[PDB]
Amino acid sequence: MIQRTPKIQVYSRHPAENGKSNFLNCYVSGFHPSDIEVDLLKNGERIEKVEHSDLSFSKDWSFYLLYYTEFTPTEKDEYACRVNHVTLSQPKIVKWDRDM
Amino acid sequence: GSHSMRYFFTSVSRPGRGEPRFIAVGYVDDTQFVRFDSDAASQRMEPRAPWIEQEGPEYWDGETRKVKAHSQTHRVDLGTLRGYYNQSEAGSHTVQRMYGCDVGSDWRFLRGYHQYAYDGKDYIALKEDLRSWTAADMAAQTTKHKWEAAHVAEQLRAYLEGTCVEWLRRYLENGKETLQRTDAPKTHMTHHAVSDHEATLRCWALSFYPAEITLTWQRDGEDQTQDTELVETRPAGDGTFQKWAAVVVPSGQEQRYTCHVQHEGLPKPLTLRWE
Amino acid sequence: YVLDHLIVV
């Protein structure tokens, strides 16, 4: 069995204007096998309504998924993505940077 | 430009807790228009793009019939492959299939794909001539010989060269507004100061379709690499994609560097300078 | 359009 560890990109659907409606995205790619756990967190608390795309894979047979929810960016608030995978010894958390 | 239609199948076996999970997704260019889930309550082929929804109830019944038949195929394939490698029953294994067709700007046949994967490795694939097979290992050779005698390549070759091209053309015309459009990137530049002596420059491309794009860093008209950071292209979530490139520059030398963007949406390659 | 032919490994 070949196993590939996932790549995580946390960003926003639109340029992050504070106090306005936007979508928060988590893009996991370059991972195998398909079983993966991805959560979106606001200040360490799980967000209830989080949708995701349909399972597909790249040319190298690696799987990719996009998790998204609606949110309002605020100077006070912090957002992040929690991704757990068999290849990961511990759940990897990536914080949201509006500049990336 | 050149267009393509691709189907991606994933079947994962759950030892114990039930039957294998089967996921099917269909793409035209970079847009997904159909999906099927074995654990979905509908148990039917569902539409994911607005332009495909205008198909008659006869179309969906046929597509639902074939995807379910293909799902039964890969569940048998999982058992057959487990015997091939002498693998234990207790393990969970994944099988994946991908076949697709390529057309040029003229909209006629260009290229074809048929590939199979077991547990994340290439298993058996159809060559570009559409008449020969490549077998990864000994277990793959057993399947190759059976498929060669049964003329599977010839039946498949007929689908890519003819059946796909006809339906790919039909799909493009039905959704001319959605997938024959080209969206130019929305470009801007940002400045980040790591320290007193060197700063980071960020090149942004946003809200563009199709996904393929080229971003290059040039210093004084010289291609700059290895000192740059490049992220994988990302989906925005509204049918548009995003990508950015960054380079580390010493202070006072920001004006030397230039960002060059090449996309189909842009009639001229764009140049971005920090000033 | 999905592949109309069925195959087994």
Author numbering:
A (entry chain i): 1 to 100
B (entry chain I): 1 to 275
C (entry chain Y): 1 to 9
Reproduce, without paraphrasing, sentences from the article in which this PDB structure was first reported.
In HLA-A:02+ individuals, the EBV-specific CD8 T-cell response is dominated by responses to two lytic cycle proteins, BRLF1 (BRLF1109-117 epitope: YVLDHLIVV) and BMLF1 (BMLF1280-288 epitope: GLCTLVAML). The interaction of CD8 TCRs with virus-derived peptides bound to MHC-I molecules (pMHC) expressed on an infected cell surface confers specificity of the CD8 T-cell response. Generation and maintenance of virus-specific CD8 T cells is dependent on specific interaction between MHC-peptide complexes on the infected cell and the TCR. We identified a TCRα chain, AV8.1-KDTDKL-AJ34, which was shared by all study participants.
We next determined the crystal structure of the HLA-A2/YVL-BR complex in order to identify specific structural features that might be associated with the dominant AV8.1-KDTDKL-AJ34 usage in the YVL-BR-specific TCRs. Structure determination was complicated initially by the relatively low resolution and high degree of translational pseudosymmetry that characterized the HLA-A2/YVL-BR crystals, but ultimately clear and continuous electron density extending the full length of the peptide allowed confident location of all peptide atoms. In the HLA-A2 complex, the nonameric YVL-BR peptide is bound in conventional orientation, with the amino terminus and side chains of Val(V) at position 2 and Val(V) at position 9 accommodated in pockets (A, B, and F, respectively) in the peptide binding site. Notably, the side chains of Tyr(Y) at position 1, highly negative charged Asp(D) at position 4, and His(H) at position 5 project away from the binding site, and compose a highly featured surface positioned for recognition by CDRα loops of a TCR bound in conventional orientation. By contrast, the side chains of Leu(L) at position 6, Ile(I) at position 7, and Val(V) at position 8, together with exposed main-chain atoms, present a rather non-descript generally hydrophobic surface positioned to interact with CDRβ loops of a TCR bound in conventional orientation. Our structural analysis revealed that the MHC-bound YVL-BR bulged at position 4, in a region of the peptide that TCRα would have to accommodate, exposing a negatively charged Asp(D). In light of this apparent TCRα bias in the YVL-BR repertoire and the substantial evidence that TCR-pMHC binding modes also contribute to TCR biases, we hypothesized that the bias for TCRα in the YVL-BR repertoire most likely reflects an inherent feature of how the YVL-BR peptide lies in the HLA-A2 groove or the topology of the pMHC. We cloned a TCR expressing the dominant public TCRα chain AV8.1-KDTDKL-AJ34 and using mutagenesis, we provided evidence indicating that the positively charged Lys(K) residue in the CDR3α of the public TCRα chain was important for YVL-BR/MHC recognition.
